[PDB]
Amino acid sequence: MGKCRGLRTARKLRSHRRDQKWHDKQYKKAHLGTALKANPFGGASHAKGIVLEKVGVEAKQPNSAIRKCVRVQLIKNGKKITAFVPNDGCLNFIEENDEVLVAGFGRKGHAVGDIPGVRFKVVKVANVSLLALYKGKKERPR
Amino acid sequence: VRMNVLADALKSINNAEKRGKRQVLIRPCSKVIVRFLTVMMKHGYIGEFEIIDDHRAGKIVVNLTGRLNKCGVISPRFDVQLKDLEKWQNNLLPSRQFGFIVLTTSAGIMDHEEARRKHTGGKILGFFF
Amino acid sequence: GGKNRRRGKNENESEKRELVFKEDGQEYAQVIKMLGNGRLEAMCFDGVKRLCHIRGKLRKKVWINTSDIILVGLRDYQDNKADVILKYNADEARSLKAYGELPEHAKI
Amino acid sequence: MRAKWRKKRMRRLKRKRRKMRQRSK
Amino acid sequence: TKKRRNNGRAKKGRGHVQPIRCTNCACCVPKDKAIKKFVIRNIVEAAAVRDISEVSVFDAYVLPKLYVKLHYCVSCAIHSKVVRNRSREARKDRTPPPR
Amino acid sequence: VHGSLARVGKVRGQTLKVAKQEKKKKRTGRAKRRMQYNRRFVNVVPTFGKKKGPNANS
RNA sequence: ACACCAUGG
RNA sequence: CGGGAAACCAAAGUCUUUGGGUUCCGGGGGGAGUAUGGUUGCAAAGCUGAAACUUAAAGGAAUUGACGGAAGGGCACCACC
RNA sequence: CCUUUAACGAGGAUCCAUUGGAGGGCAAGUCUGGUCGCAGCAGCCGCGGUAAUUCCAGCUCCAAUAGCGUAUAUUAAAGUU
Ligand SMILES: [Mg+2]
Ligand SMILES: [Mg+2]
Ligand SMILES: [Mg+2]
Ligand SMILES: [Mg+2]
Ligand SMILES: [Mg+2]
Ligand SMILES: [Mg+2]
Ligand SMILES: [Mg+2]
Ligand SMILES: [Mg+2]
Ligand SMILES: [Mg+2]
Ligand SMILES: [Mg+2]
Ligand SMILES: [Mg+2]
Ligand SMILES: [Mg+2]
Ligand SMILES: [Mg+2]
Ligand SMILES: [Mg+2]
Ligand SMILES: [Mg+2]
Ligand SMILES: [Mg+2]
Ligand SMILES: [Mg+2]
Ligand SMILES: [Mg+2]
Ligand SMILES: [Mg+2]
Ligand SMILES: [Mg+2]
Ligand SMILES: [Mg+2]
Ligand SMILES: [Mg+2]
Ligand SMILES: [Mg+2]
Ligand SMILES: [Mg+2]
Ligand SMILES: [Mg+2]
Ligand SMILES: [Mg+2]
Ligand SMILES: [Mg+2]
Ligand SMILES: [Mg+2]
Ligand SMILES: [Mg+2]
């Protein structure tokens, strides 16, 4: 309903755009610093940790299954996260007190699918990938 | 208030063309309005025009053909320097075969096609097509 | 309880019933008390209470009220959790009591 | 009206918590 | 959404109008929102006029009227069937119903 | 259901094994592209109305 | 010139 | 006239044929006008004002049904009198 | 190392091409066995409760190809700054 068009208003336009960028969600999330602090990864793509004990997250109402997550503690921070072990019978490959490398789930901050409270997945069990053990291309070292 | 006289002269010409009127009256008159109308008439978008002279700024009566499609103003008079001109006439104009951009250069009020022919930039006023 | 619900599989009741016993990693239990969200508190007929979850197959098709005999399948990794697999009626509960299946601490 | 009653209950809780925090401090 | 151009009230170029009490409800309704009705009825009756025009000790006695100005709730007037609903296109007819 | 219905690897642990029946070596590089060109631009038998998806089992 | 009228595998 | 998702609007029009001047202000739904710091007030409270976390929709206008302890006109001893 | 060169060095069964997928978005099967709201899949909508086009496999087919998939930062899409 009105914006200054005049020839010496570069300061007003620039300052208003700079002031209003702070209402864009992703801009503020990326430039504030609270998300980089609250992120259980230190702003990294992957992270190694130790398995505390396996758990049985039950899926949300329109589906029914028991999703079989694990509870990991991260090396560099000491934070406790919950990670997902995706495949048919891949929870047998993960004992307790063995270090696993986990990665993100694919939405950059959010729960994917019917699983509540889970945001990461497990990609390596002990220096060997969960996709070589799932096809028999490798095996656990003991 | 009437900050800009040319803006409302051109908007009152353009509001009447959409309506089929044979004539308009526009007021106040100004030096830049008469030059812009002469440029718009040399090409054939409007007919003759008459200046009514009170002892004040005056009024103009324009004979409208049916050829004018749109005329308008660029609100701050930006500086245009013979290299911005192509990027200007790719936003304002509807094609490359017709329609003119009007700018004031140190050699008078003219169109872009004459500005490049005389190697001069200046300030943009408006356009008509 | 009566309703306009003539729709749905109409009538799943009969005077005949056949027993089902325990298996590998599968125990009996007694409902201790009712919770929300379809959950439940139970008590395995020997040890732990082992809070249970009513599985997707039983939801609103076979109801479970407090203080009844049930057959639950234990989880290997977790211990305190289990899933309600089957319900035992009064006659079948007493039958199990006769066959000596359940340690006779809970009665019908 | 859940809106103004929500408002009043939140105002009450906030008054209580502020008065407690000030008293014990 | 916006059901009436005039918001269901006669106010234009004013901030405030004085409230008034709904005549059976005792409600509190703005003077130019309330539903008004001016009744002018015979004091005696329409049927029992003969029993009185005959007993009167005056030969030509005209019976007085009884003027009352009634103000109504919106709900209270809808409930006594002083007004009713109308079609979306018929709500725009503002003429008094034919006698 | 028989015992710990929430067991892991249940369905993959009771699937009948089938050996792969494979033999013939598949062509590679330019030779595959040459075959795919033939199989749809010059090896053709046309009809109106009908549907002809390359894997149609119907 | 207006008694009561809650809930839903 | 023209505009708009439409309800509607001579302005909510002169807008992809986009530029008359200028102030305020919004950026999916919640957490929340909350916590915290500042300021004002005798008090109640006003002004300024986040985040972690959570979620696939919340919402607007209009259409066709069904329902109404809504109104009008009719009807049936599987309704009443 | 390349380049130049001798002498050996191919019948396709090995001198054996992979990585992802086949409901939609989005190129490609309502083919056959197994499981039966479980195991699992699924970026999103959604698949599985005894006749599964989506799970586990076999066969067939689609895409790019000595490369292809995944997690994260960022740009265009965003006229959602
Ligand atoms: Mg705000
Ligand atoms: Mg948010
Ligand atoms: Mg309404
Ligand atoms: Mg007011
Ligand atoms: Mg009722
Ligand atoms: Mg109740
Ligand atoms: Mg209730
Ligand atoms: Mg219901
Ligand atoms: Mg206006
Ligand atoms: Mg204007
Ligand atoms: Mg928001
Ligand atoms: Mg505010
Ligand atoms: Mg404060
Ligand atoms: Mg959903
Ligand atoms: Mg509505
Ligand atoms: Mg409707
Ligand atoms: Mg009626
Ligand atoms: Mg009759
Ligand atoms: Mg009777
Ligand atoms: Mg080198
Ligand atoms: Mg393959
Ligand atoms: Mg697959
Ligand atoms: Mg398959
Ligand atoms: Mg697809
Ligand atoms: Mg397709
Ligand atoms: Mg089958
Ligand atoms: Mg099948
Ligand atoms: Mg961007
Ligand atoms: Mg955004």
Swiss-Prot record, chain A:
PTM characteristics: Hydroxylation at Pro-62 affects translation termination efficiency.
Composition-biased stretches (Basic residues): 1-20
3-hydroxyproline: residues carrying this PTM: 62
Quaternary structure note: Component of the 40S small ribosomal subunit. Part of the small subunit (SSU) processome, composed of more than 70 proteins and the RNA chaperone small nucleolar RNA (snoRNA) U3.
Recorded family membership: Belongs to the universal ribosomal protein uS12 family.
Function noted in UniProt: Component of the ribosome, a large ribonucleoprotein complex responsible for the synthesis of proteins in the cell. The small ribosomal subunit (SSU) binds messenger RNAs (mRNAs) and translates the encoded message by selecting cognate aminoacyl-transfer RNA (tRNA) molecules. The large subunit (LSU) contains the ribosomal catalytic site termed the peptidyl transferase center (PTC), which catalyzes the formation of peptide bonds, thereby polymerizing the amino acids delivered by tRNAs into a polypeptide chain.
Official protein name in the record: Small ribosomal subunit protein uS12
Source taxonomy: Eukaryota, Metazoa, Chordata, Craniata, Vertebrata
Curated annotation (Swiss-Prot), chain B:
GO molecular function, one term: structural constituent of ribosome
Compartments reported by the entry: Cytoplasm; Nucleus, Nucleolus
SUPFAM superfamilies: Ribosomal protein S8
GO cellular component: cytosolic ribosome; nucleolus; ribonucleoprotein complex
Domain of life: Eukaryota
Transmembrane helix found in the keyword field: no
N6-succinyllysine modifications at: 87
Alphabetized PROSITE patterns for the sequence: RIBOSOMAL_S8
Keyword Oxidoreductase found: no
Gene3D superfamilies linked: 3.30.1370.30, 3.30.1490.10
Main location: cytoplasm
Alphabetical GO biological process terms: translation
This protein's UniProt keywords: Cytoplasm, Nucleus, Ribonucleoprotein, Ribosomal protein
UniProt subunit comment: Component of the 40S ribosomal subunit. Part of the small subunit (SSU) processome, composed of more than 70 proteins and the RNA chaperone small nucleolar RNA (snoRNA) U3.
Family matches, as NCBIfam families: PRK04034.1
Family from the record: Belongs to the universal ribosomal protein uS8 family.
HAMAP family in the cross-refs: Ribosomal_uS8_A
Role description: Component of the small ribosomal subunit. Part of the small subunit (SSU) processome, first precursor of the small eukaryotic ribosomal subunit. During the assembly of the SSU processome in the nucleolus, many ribosome biogenesis factors, an RNA chaperone and ribosomal proteins associate with the nascent pre-rRNA and work in concert to generate RNA folding, modifications, rearrangements and cleavage as well as targeted degradation of pre-ribosomal RNA by the RNA exosome. Required for proper erythropoiesis.
Protein name listed in UniProt: Small ribosomal subunit protein uS8
Species per Swiss-Prot/TrEMBL record: Oryctolagus cuniculus (Rabbit)
Swiss-Prot record, chain D:
Pfam family, one: Ribosomal_L41
Segments of this protein annotated with the region Disordered: 1-25
UniProt entry keywords in alphabetical sequence: Cytoplasm, Ribonucleoprotein, Ribosomal protein
Any Gene Ontology CC annotation: cytoplasm
Any one Gene Ontology BP term: translation
Gene Ontology MF annotations: structural constituent of ribosome
Localisation: Cytoplasm
Subunit record text: Component of the small ribosomal subunit.
Family: Belongs to the eukaryotic ribosomal protein eS32 family.
Known function: Component of the small ribosomal subunit. The ribosome is a large ribonucleoprotein complex responsible for the synthesis of proteins in the cell. Interacts with the beta subunit of protein kinase CKII and stimulates phosphorylation of DNA topoisomerase II alpha by CKII.
Name of protein: Small ribosomal subunit protein eS32
Originating species: Oryctolagus cuniculus
Swiss-Prot record, chain F:
N6-succinyllysine: residues bearing it: 50
Compartments in which it is found: Cytoplasm; Nucleus
Known function: Component of the 40S subunit of the ribosome. Contributes to the assembly and function of 40S ribosomal subunits.
Description of how the protein assembles with itself and partners: Component of the 40S subunit of the ribosome.
Protein name: Small ribosomal subunit protein eS30
Native organism: Oryctolagus cuniculus (Rabbit)
Gene label: FAU
Location of this fragment in the whole protein: 76 to 133 of 133
